[PDB]
């Protein structure tokens, strides 16, 4: 009726993401002291003009709510600078990650390990992952000895680098438009409960309005191409509704896999299971089917050099 896309002998209707589906940027700062005590604690050099890229997207998309999910040990003056950024740009909403309740998506590590110890033991010995079974029992022992209430959220709260960003990115997108309402952001134009969200990496420059997008079952992700290879990525994630069952599938993998990675399993694994991009299927065909394509999204150029 409004479009249709085919992958692995299954039809997926192209579902619309209206022009008021909010945009999401994410800045988790590990050293806020590198910025001045009265500066917006987002990197903004000429190598990484991330704050400028976020503003330019907010300037282009006037009517659309622009979300910025932040985290870190910011000084009081840095939070006022962020508070003033929300004042200069009416559509910019700064959401602190600590203000959101993710407990409904959480699971105890001891629960995951026990399930897998039972699951692997039921497999005959000639097929059991013997190395993994010992590792899980080892992981369970350390949880019971050091932090028996450790959960996916608490364990990921302690990690460093991208794995903790990627973790909360998937969870925010499951909240979707509700996250802005939960965070108490007033006046978000046409923001509806149950609505979707469009995450964009901060090193990408939006040069024109996205308009209305039409994505298979209302989801699409970035597909990066390096050399002669392509790969599913989380640099762009667009969903047309909250709790999108594909992202929910990625979380379900996190709840059943012993050492689930928020990127490999929460995004790539969830997408491949959801659309049946099996090991025997054409990964290249899936990439073209699921790829977020838009003329007005521009890749970072500062990356580049001779060759």
Numbering used by the authors: 26 to 332
Question: What's the publication's text?
Answer:
Three highly related Salmonella effectors, SseK1, SseK2, and SseK3, orthologues of the enteropathogenic and enterohemorrhagic Escherichia coli T3SS effector NleB1 (7), translocate via the T3SS into the host cell. Similarly to NleB1 (9, 10), SseK1 and SseK3 are N-acetylglucosamine (GlcNAc) transferases that modify the TNFR1-associated death domain protein TRADD and inhibit activation of the pro-inflammatory transcription factor NF-κB, as well as necroptotic host cell death. Here we report the structure of the Salmonella arginine N-glycosyltransferase, SseK3, in its apo and ligand-bound forms. The SseK3 catalytic core domain (∼250 residues) shows the classic features of the large glycosyltransferase type-A family of enzymes (GT-A) consisting of a single module composed of a central parallel β-sheet core flanked by a number of α-helices.
Crystals of SseK3(14–333) enriched with selenomethionine diffracted to good resolution, but most of them exhibited severe anisotropy, were non-isomorphous, and showed translational non-crystallographic symmetry. Attempts to solve the structure by molecular replacement using available glycosyltransferase X-ray structures or selenium SAD phasing failed. Instead, we recorded data at the I23 long-wavelength beamline at Diamond Light Source to reveal the positions of the selenium and sulfur atoms within SseK3 based on the small anomalous signals present at long wavelengths to obtain an initial model. This model was used as template in a molecular replacement search with a complete 2.21 Å resolution data set that did not exhibit severe diffraction anisotropy. that overlap with a root mean square deviation (RMSD) (Cα of residues 27–328) of 0.91 Å. The structure of apo-SseK3(14–333) is reported in Fig. 2A. Residues 14–25 are not visible in the electronic density for either chain, nor are amino acids 329–333 of chain B and the last serine residue (Ser-333) of chain A. Residues 27–321 of SseK3 in the apo and ligand-bound forms overlap with an RMSD of 0.84 Å, whereas residues 322–332 of SseK3(14–333) are unstructured with an average B factor of 45.5 Å2, compared with the average macromolecule B factor of 33.3 Å2. As suggested by solution NMR spectroscopy, the C-terminal residues are disordered in the unbound SseK3 structure, with structural reorganization following primary substrate binding, with an open-close catalytic cycle that, as in the case of a number of other glycosyltransferases, is likely to support SseK3 enzymatic activity. UDP-GlcNAc hydrolysis is not observed with SseK3(14–333) or in the absence of enzyme, indicating that together, the C-terminal residues Trp-334 and Arg-335 are necessary for SseK3 functional activity.
